[PDB]
């Protein structure tokens, strides 16, 4: 197992094989630079933080899908995300949906993040085998370059196959993920990973998406979003963000409105 | 293991011990006659116009041709959402079932359980079969869900009263279905409640009487599992009239896992702070 970097046109079956063998990979040019920049600009325009000028004469961050039209209209429809999620969660769990998504702004001077698996906050990971499907998957998209010096994510290829209770990987066995703007690192919930120290004078920036099986409760709820935004989402994204009924592998539906579909009861 | 009939004032510790040992029990006088009638009055028109059988096709064919199982009880019954979902027995048992391992719990689903005269016996099943992760679970682990089946009409053998198999919750996930001769019918007057952890093998019986047999149910499961029923379609003034507890139960508040980790959150803060709840 190694850290693989693959082009955008890599066949899906290759990507899933690499995920199975090494537990992680990078898809180069996952997004164009303009798209990842657009999410940042829309986030900045939402929070409207005051930035002083040279001399004298605001909202708190919320869901990325609420702050960024590009995130909810373009990013969450990314075909690579759904191609992988369909194959990772589909055969066992049926539908999947959005787990959580955050802006990554690694501050200069931040030290090394502890090495961890993402599925630790699922109590059922204590029951899961390494051969089972993953409990969640994360897509980390680079806005700025990911370098060794600015604290880019580090992975340990193959550590997703380790048994439960296995010791953390050694610091020297971590592999830095070197990414250009628009690249994306695929992080299944079983991959041990950590952010490095930002020993530069500039921010390391990016954002994440994550998805997990329909029968698990997402980190984030989007129920507070204005109806106008929901109605402009694709049906796929409406399902991703908790506005539609989900189908289990046994065809039983969850997140229903009574015995019917949520979207029929809300008038979507 | 045995099927026990206990009074309402049974200490919580005895109820938990019976659930651990025998996998089920009946709590008599769980609701009073006033609550039984108020629920029956609020759901009368609803169940009558409801069409029997399952509404959609799925792999669990345990809804017979003469069975009506309508849900959406919080939308259709004020007493369900303002009082029943606040029931102290449900929350006391749920906190001790899911708390130490999962943290918060919330509402899973809740159906009317109405047997028309002539309905045949339901297939014997565990309620948590529709969780893929029950295959991963071991019998000594906490349950994935728990059900409270409350009698609205009397529950008798001949009217299709629920049947359980005490001690079948401790079977391994590969164990075959209990034999029909192994099932124990339960006896309930209106307002009695049968407690059904998701691992207990149970089924409704055949309604060989001239009167329908009706119950209704609540069910709760850990905060990290997706409820079978959403409630985001309910009107806001309904939500504002709920207690904050029932508000959490029905998915209008952020949930706390077992390690200061929150799920069902609005970006950074809580969902309730984002909607002005
Ligand atoms: C298909 C059926 C008949 C079954 O064979 C086994 C489990 C489920 C899927 C029911 C229908 C709906 C549920 C969904 C719910 C959350 C609330 C309902 C209920 O109140 O009674 C049936 C349920 C149950 C107790 C069992 C569960 C439950 O877990
Ligand atoms: O109606 C009953 O008594 C039992 C119904 C049931 O077990 C079920 O629907 O899963
Ligand atoms: Fe059941």
Numbering used by the authors:
A (entry chain D): 4 to 60, 70 to 280
B (entry chain C): 4 to 280
Paper text:
Here, we report the biochemical and structural characterizations of the unusually promiscuous and catalytically versatile Fe/αKG oxygenase SptF, involved in the biosynthesis of fungal meroterpenoid emervaridones. The in vitro analysis revealed that SptF catalyzes several continuous oxidation reactions, including hydroxylation, desaturation, epoxidation, and skeletal rearrangement. Fe/αKG oxygenases utilize αKG as a co-substrate and Fe(II) as a cofactor. Through the oxidative decarboxylation of αKG, a reactive Fe(IV)-oxo intermediate is generated to activate a selective aliphatic C–H bond, which is normally difficult to cleave due to high bond-dissociation energy, and then oxidative products are generated following radical recombination.
SptF is an Fe/αKG oxygenase first discovered in the biosynthesis of the fungal meroterpenoid emervaridones. It catalyzes two oxidation steps to form emervaridone C from andiconin D. In the active site, 1 or 6 is located on the opposite side of the facial triad in an almost identical fashion, indicating that the size of the A-ring does not affect the binding mode. The distance between the iron and the initial reaction site C11 of 1 and 6 is 4.2 and 4.3 Å, respectively, which are close enough for hydrogen atom abstraction by the C–H bond activation. The active site hydrophobic residues, Ile63, Phe133, and Ile231, are located within van der Waals distances of the B/C-ring, suggesting that a hydrophobic surface facilitates the substrate binding. In contrast, the D/E-rings of 1 and 6 are tightly fixed by several hydrophilic residues located on the bottom surface of the active site cavity: the carbonyl oxygen of the E-ring interacts with Ser114, while the carbonyl oxygen of the D-ring interacts with the main chains of Leu199 and Thr148 via water molecules. Hydrogen abstraction at C11 of 1 by the ferryl species first generates a radical, which undergoes recombination to cleave the C–C bond between C4’ and C3’ and bridge C4’ and C11, but not through the hydroxylated intermediate.
